[PDB]
């Protein structure tokens, strides 16, 4: 096979937005492999070497007046402009979660089980998932996958509750998320899965 | 604390002569440019309904990336990249139910350089039907991530693996999924 050495250049032109577009920070960042070597930060207003590999460029670019003026205007000509273009389908994207609750294993009541609250297909990533046992919030014995990006502008998470369920108990998974216009709860009733009555 | 980040991320890699030009919003791809076809490729079709991007502009940027790479390679005395092997996870898109269409996701994370071979296997055999993949997606630590997808009909019979090859690995890396 081909095991010749590799050499990688990256550039990242970043726009960071705070309180809508009230505050914007623009970064023009250049990398050799993973090493950032030179950067323009709009909070600074000129290029700075990040490593010694970048020193020749910070000096050279900062000596070009038209160059600096263009980068100093980027917060508007580039960042706020592109925020406006994309807002409706990015910033304002809200996709409602599909929520499924199930026991991890078919187990008779009065034995340990894991109750799974699978929260799928949602956007954006900010979410709170809570477990309740007969209306009391459970805090211990709660394990999750964390937030999983699917790569297609949706997320999922599985949030599991360790418990020993008994006949007549009602467990509830509650989701809080920006897509909701009203509350989202899904119940699992222990008496719906009484394997050995 | 910031609310959102938009990044125009690019790379050029030697000696492969491979490059990429994409935009990222909060960690998801808006689009990339197919530089062979000179075409803007939107990650979700619907993004192109109102927005546009002049794909030729990417080619100009990639030519600067190449020229810059040549310079940085010399400045570094031909210090090459250190291979960082991927972490691989296989996921389903939704809870799995027999005979209900689903999608296997192979998530390839925390690796560099951005050259990888990913093959879906059904019962050990490469699947080259109905598969899709993303371009290389940038990480905040300047490594890469990537997704490959396989629509499937769940059964008790079949098993699946995502096979990943990368210069940082000692052997092909297999991540398994089967019905439970």
């Amino acid at each position: 096979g081909d095991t010749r050495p590799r050499f990688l250049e990256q550039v990242k032109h970043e726009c960071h937005f705070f309180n809508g577009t009230e505050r914007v920070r623009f970064l023009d960042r250049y990398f050799y492999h993973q090493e950032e070597y030179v950067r323009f930060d709009s909070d600074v207003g000129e290029y700075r070497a990040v490593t010694e590999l970048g020193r020749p460029d910070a000096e050279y670019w900062n000596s070009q007046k038209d160059l600096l003026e263009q980068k100093r205007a980027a917060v508007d000509t580039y960042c706020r402009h592109n925020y406006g273009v994309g807002e409706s389908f990015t910033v304002q994207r809200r996709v409602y979660p599909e929520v499924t609750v199930y026991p991890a294993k078919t187990q008779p009541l009065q034995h340990h089980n894991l109750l799974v609250c699978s929260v799928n297909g949602f956007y954006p990533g900010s979410i709170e998932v809570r477990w309740f046992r007969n209306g009391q919030e459970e805090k211990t014995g709660v394990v999750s996958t964390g937030l999983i990006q699917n790569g297609d502008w949706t997320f999922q998470t599985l949030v599991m509750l360790e418990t020993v369920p008994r006949s007549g108990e009602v467990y509830t998974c509650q989701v809080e998320h920006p897509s909701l216009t009203s509350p989202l709860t899904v119940e699992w009733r222990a008496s719906s899965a009484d394997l050995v009555p | 604390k910031e609310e959102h980040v938009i990044i125009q991320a690019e790379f050029y890699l030697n000696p492969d002569q491979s490059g990429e030009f994409m935009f990222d919003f909060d960690g998801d791809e808006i689009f990339h440019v197919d530089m062979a076809k000179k075409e803007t490729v939107w990650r979700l079709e619907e993004f192109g309904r109102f927005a546009s991007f002049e794909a030729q502009g990417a080619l100009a940027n990639i030519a600067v990336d190449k020229a810059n790479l040549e310079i940085m390679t010399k400045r570094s005395n031909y210090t090459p990249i250190t291979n960082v092997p991927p972490e691989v996870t296989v996921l389903t898109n939704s809870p799995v139910e027999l005979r209900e269409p689903n999608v296997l996701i192979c998530f390839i994370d925390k690796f560099t350089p951005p050259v990888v071979n990913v093959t879906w296997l059904r019962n050990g055999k490469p699947v080259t039907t109905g598969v899709s993949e993303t371009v290389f997606l940038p990480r905040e630590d300047h490594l890469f991530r990537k997704f490959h997808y396989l629509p499937f009909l769940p059964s008790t019979e079949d098993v699946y693996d995502c096979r990943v090859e990368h210069w940082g690995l000692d052997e092909p890396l297999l991540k398994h999924w089967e019905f439970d």
Partner: peptide
């Protein structure tokens, strides 16, 4: 509406 492209600056070929 058109998405704006950021330009890349060209490193000094400081020979």
């Amino acid at each position: 509406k058109r998405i704006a492209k950021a330009v890349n600056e060209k490193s000094c070929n400081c020979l």
